[PDB]
Ligand binder design. Sequence first.
Ligand SMILES: NS(=O)(=O)c1ccccc1Cl
Ligand SMILES: NS(=O)(=O)c1ccccc1Cl
Ligand SMILES: Nc1ccc2n[nH]cc2c1
Lengths: 201, 1031
Amino acid sequence: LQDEEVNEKLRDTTFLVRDGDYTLTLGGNNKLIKIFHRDSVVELINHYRNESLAQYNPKLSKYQQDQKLHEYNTQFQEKSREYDRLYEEYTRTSQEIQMKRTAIEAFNETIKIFEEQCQTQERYSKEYINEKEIQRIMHNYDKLKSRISEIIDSRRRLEEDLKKQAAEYREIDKRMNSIKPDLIQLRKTRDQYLMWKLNEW
Amino acid sequence: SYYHHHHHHDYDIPMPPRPSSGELWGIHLMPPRILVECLLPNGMIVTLECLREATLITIKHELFKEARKYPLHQLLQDESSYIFVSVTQEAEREEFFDETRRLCDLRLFQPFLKVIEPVGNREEKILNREIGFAIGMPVCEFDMVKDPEVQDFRRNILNVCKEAVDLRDLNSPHSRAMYVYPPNVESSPELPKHIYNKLDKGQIIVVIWVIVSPNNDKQKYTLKINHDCVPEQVIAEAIRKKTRSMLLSSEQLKLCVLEYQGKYILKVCGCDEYFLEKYPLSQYKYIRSCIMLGRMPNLMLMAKESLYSQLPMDCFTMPSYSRETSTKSLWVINSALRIKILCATYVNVIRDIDKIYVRTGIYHGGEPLCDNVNTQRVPCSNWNEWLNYDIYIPDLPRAARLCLSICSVCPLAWGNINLFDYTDTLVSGKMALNLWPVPHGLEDLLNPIGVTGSNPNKETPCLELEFDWFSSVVKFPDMSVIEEHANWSVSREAGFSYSHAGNELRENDKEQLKAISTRDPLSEITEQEKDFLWSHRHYCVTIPEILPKLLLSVKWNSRDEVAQMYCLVKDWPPIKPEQAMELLDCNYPDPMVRGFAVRCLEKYLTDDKLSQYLIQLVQVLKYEQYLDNLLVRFLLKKALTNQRIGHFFFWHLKSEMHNKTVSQRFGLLLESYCRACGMYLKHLNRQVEAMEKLINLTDILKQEKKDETQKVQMKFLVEQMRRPDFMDALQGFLSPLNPAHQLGNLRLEECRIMSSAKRPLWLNWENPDIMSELLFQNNEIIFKNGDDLRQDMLTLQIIRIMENIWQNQGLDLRMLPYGCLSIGDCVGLIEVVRNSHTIMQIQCKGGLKGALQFNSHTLHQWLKDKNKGEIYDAAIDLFTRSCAGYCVATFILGIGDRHNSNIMVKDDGQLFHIDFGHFLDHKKKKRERVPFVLTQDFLIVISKGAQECTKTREFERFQEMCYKAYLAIRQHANLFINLFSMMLGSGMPELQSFDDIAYIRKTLALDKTEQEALEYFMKQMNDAHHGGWTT
Ligand SMILES: NS(=O)(=O)c1ccccc1Cl
Ligand SMILES: NS(=O)(=O)c1ccccc1Cl
Ligand SMILES: Nc1ccc2n[nH]cc2c1
C-alpha cells in the first residue's frame, strides 16, 4: 500500500506504483490503467504481478538497495565533457572525411581532362611530325606530364591523409562505445544517492 | 599552500567547420591576379595570368589574342563558336555558358579552363545551372540515380507544377500579380476592440499619394474613411479629391471618377506590398500595424499598366524527363513474419565490450509485437538466422516498418526499413542497410522515430538482410477489398452475448467521451479508455475532435480494427487545421489518416495561416514514408500559387540541404519548385549568390583574420566590399527576411563587424523604392555566421503565435518577435530593430561618472527623457504590457535565464527579449524555473515612480494582465504541444522526444484544474521574487 515522470524515469524493462486514483504502468510497451476501490485493494495487486489478469487482452519494482557522497558527479560530468568533445571531434571529422572524398573526386576528374589533353597533343604531335618548331612543340608536351605528375602526387597525399583520417575517425567511434555504458552506470548510482533542497554536492 | 604542492604533469598549454568551399580549393580568397592553365583542342596549354575578378568574356577575348603567338594556331574558329569548362569544388564538369560571370564566382577546384564547342545546341535548357545554383547541388546528380521512386517522383510531381502554372495565367495579368504580390492579410476581417478604440467609431485617416509628370513632384491626398472600406473605394475617394473643381458639377465629377477609377491600384510606400483584392483596409496588416503604432498609412496610386509591366510570363516547359505478375493480396499469404539477419561489417569496438547483437522490432511509431533480438554470436571480431516475429502477415498495417540496430554488453548503429514499397508492394529479397550512428544522448536501444531508409554514406556499418519470398509479388489490398472486410466484420460484430469490446444504447458516459475529446495530445490514454473509445467509435463521428485519440486507440496489428477505421476516416467530417496538424506528426504514419489531415488543410487553412505554420509543415515532410505523397503535392502547389509562401518554402528546404538525411527528398522538391516557380528563380539566385559571398567573407574573418585587432579586420572588410565582384553580388536583391523589402546599393560607410566573436556583420543597404522617405531609407540587417538560428527561429515563431492568440481574444500584450531566418548550417539573418538598447546599455548611458554603482531608477529616468509629457503615461503602459506578455511566454517556454545583456528596451518604452538560448529548460533539469525575473529596475517603471513598488495599484493591474494572458495560452495549449511535436524531425538537441516537450505541460499544468493552474502560476511567480504574488 504505502510500505509523466513515470514515462521519463521508467527508462526500460514492468511494475510501477503512481499517486481510479492510482495508476499501473507495466505485456507490451508501457501500458496503463486504473479503477476505484471496486473489488481487497492491495492483495489483488500481488496477483496480476505474477499470475492471470486474463480479464483483459494480454495476461502476461522500487525501494532501493545494492549498497553518501559527491564524488561521482565530477566523474560523471567530466567524463560527459569528454564524450561531448568526442562527439565534436567525431562530428568535425565526419564532415572533414567527406570533404576529402569529394575533393578526391575533384582530382580524379580533373586528371581525366589532363589525361585527355596529353592525348589531344599525342594525336596532334603524330599528325604534324623545322627541327626547332618540333623542339618548341616537344617542350610544351613536357610540362603537361610534369604538371600531371604533381596533380596525381597531390591526390595521393590527400588519399593517405584520408586513410589516417578514416582510421582516426573510426577510433573516436570506438572510444565512445566504451564511454556510453560506463557513463550510464555512473548516472544510475547517482539517482540512488538522490533517494536519501540540501544538495550542495 | 594552495594545491598541496601537487603537480599536474599533463598540463602543457597548447565550428562549423574548416577551410575550403570558397573561390578555389582550400583557399577562401584567391589572390588578385592568378595563373590559369588554359587547355584547347590543340593540346596546347597556354598559361594566362589574369585578374581574379575578371569576366570570362575577357579571358576568352584575351586568349583568342594570346593564341596567335603559341604553336599550331590557324585552327581555332571565330571565338563566337567556343565555350570554356572546368571542374568545380562539388566535383562536376561545368560548361560555362554565361560568360559575364567572373573568374572568382566559378567556384573552381584548381584554376584551369578547358576550351570546347557547345554540344546539345540547347544552351536554353542547359540553364538549369541556375537550378543547381539555387538548390546547391547539380541537377545531373539526380539524373544518374538508380532508385525508381526517385526517377518517378521527378516525372510525376510535374502534374502539380503544370496545374499550378495554369492557375497563374487563368485571368492574366491580375492572376499573375496575385501570385507575385499576394495580399498580406490577417485571417479574420473583424477587428479587435482595443484596435477599434483608436478610430472615431470606425474611421482612419489615410494618406494616398500620386506622382504625375514631371514626376519630380508627389502629392498628398489625405482622406478619412471607414476601417471596413475596400481598396477599390479608397481609390475613388482619392480621385474624388484630386479631380474636384469649380468647373465640375457633381454629375460631371461622378463620370470623371468611374473612368479613372479602374486604372489604378494601391501600393504601400517604400516597400513592395500591394492591396490587390476585396478586403477591409483593416484586414491588411500594414494598416492594422499603422493603427496600433500611431501612424497614418502612406499608400500610393499606381497605374495598373506600370505594375503589369513588371511581371514577365512564366514560360514554363517540361524537362527532358518526359518518357504484370497479376498480384497476391497481402491477406491471402498464410504466414507469420520472418526476416533474415545475415552479416554486418565495419563495427567499431574486444577488451572492454563483452558481446554484440542485432536487435529488431516491427513498428508504427509504437510497437505491433514482441520485438526479438537474435542470439549473440562472435562478439566484435567480424549471424545467418531466419528470425520469427509474432504477427500474421495479413495483419501488417500499410505504414508498417522494421526498425533495427546493433547493441552491446547500449547501441552502436541503427537503421529502419519500410516493410512496403512505395508501390504498395510487400518487400521480398535481400537488403543492404547502411546504418546511422546514434544521435548524441539517445539512451533508448532502437530508433523508430528516426528516418526511414539506408544511409547514403557507403563508408558505414552496412547490414545485409533477406525478406521472406511468398511465391509471387505481394501487394497491399485495394480499398474495394478493405471496405468489404469492414462491412463483414461489422455485421459479424452484431451477434454475441458477453461484456468486452476493444449495443446501440447512448447513456451519459457519452460525456466521459467529451472529457477525453478535450485532453492535450501528451495526456496519456489508458487501455480501458482505448477500449471505451474503440467500442463507441461510430458515435465519435458527432465529436470529430476526438479522432486523434480514437486513432491511437486502434490496434494497427489487427487488420479487422484498421479496415473499420479506414472506413470511418473515409467520410469522417473535416476538423480544424490546428488539430489535423497533430495528424501529421510521427505518431500518425498511416496514409489514409494523413490524407484526411491534408484534406482538412486544403479545405480550411488560409494562405495566411499556412504561412504562419510553414516551418512545421516542412519538417513534417521528413516523417512521410515515401517521396511522393499528398502533403508534398499540397505544399508544392501552395508554394507555386503564392510567392510569399514559395519564398520561405524554398529557404526552409535549402537551409537544410547540408543535412544528408533530407538532402535528396528536399533537393528533389526544390528542383520541382525551381523549374515551375518562374522568374523568382532569378531573384532567389541573386539572394543565393549574395549569401555565398557573405559566408565566404565571414569564414575568412572567423579562421584566418582572428586577432588582427578590430581595426585590421574592418580594413579588410571594407577592402572586400569595395571589390567589384562584391558590389555586383551584394547590391541589387531582395531581403530574404522579407522580400517585400528591396536592398540596393550597400552603404559601406555604415557596414561593420559587430563585436561578438562569431564575427556577425551589420549590413546597411539603401532602400531603392521611389517613396522610401515615407517608410525607411536605410534597411539594415545582421548576417551571423556561427550560431545555429533554428531554435531562435522557433521561439520567435511561438512568441508570434501567442501575440495573436492574445490580440484576437482582446488582450493587447505587445511582443516584438523580430525577424530571423536560418539559411544553412548555423548561418542566418537577424532583422535589426532600430532605436533599442540593452538594459546594460541604459545603465552605462545614465551611470554617474567614476564607477561605484549604476542606480535602479536609471532605466525609469531614461524613459522619462524619451517619453516627456502626456506621452509618459502611454510609454509606461507599453512597457507594462510588453513586460507582462514576455514574463508569461518566457515562463511558459522556459527559455534561458534573462539577464541585463539579453533584455532590450526601445525609446518608445517597449521591452523585448533577444538571444533566447535553449527553450524547453534543456540542461538545467539535472526545476519549474522562472527565467525572466522582475528586478527593482523594472518594477519601478511599472509602478511609475513609487518606492515600496511591489504593492502599488499599477503593479496589481500588471499582475492582472499576466493572469489573463497565462490562462489565454492555457486554453490554446493543444496548438503549442503540436507545433512542438511536429518539430521533432528537425535536428534540434532541445527536441528529441515527446518527453522533452513535457516541460510545457508542467508549466501550463494541464493535469490540474485551472484554479490549480493559476495558483501554480502565482506560487511560482511568488517563489521567484520572494515578495508579491498572493491573491
Ligand atoms: N574498401 S575500399 O573502400 O574499396 C578501398 C580500400 C582500400 C583503398 C581504397 C578503397 Cl576505395
Ligand atoms: N547573371 S549576371 O548578369 O552574370 C550577374 C553576375 C553577378 C551579379 C549580378 C548578375 Cl545579374
Ligand atoms: N481565397 C482562398 C484562399 C485560400 C484557399 N484555399 N483553398 C481555397 C482558397 C481560397
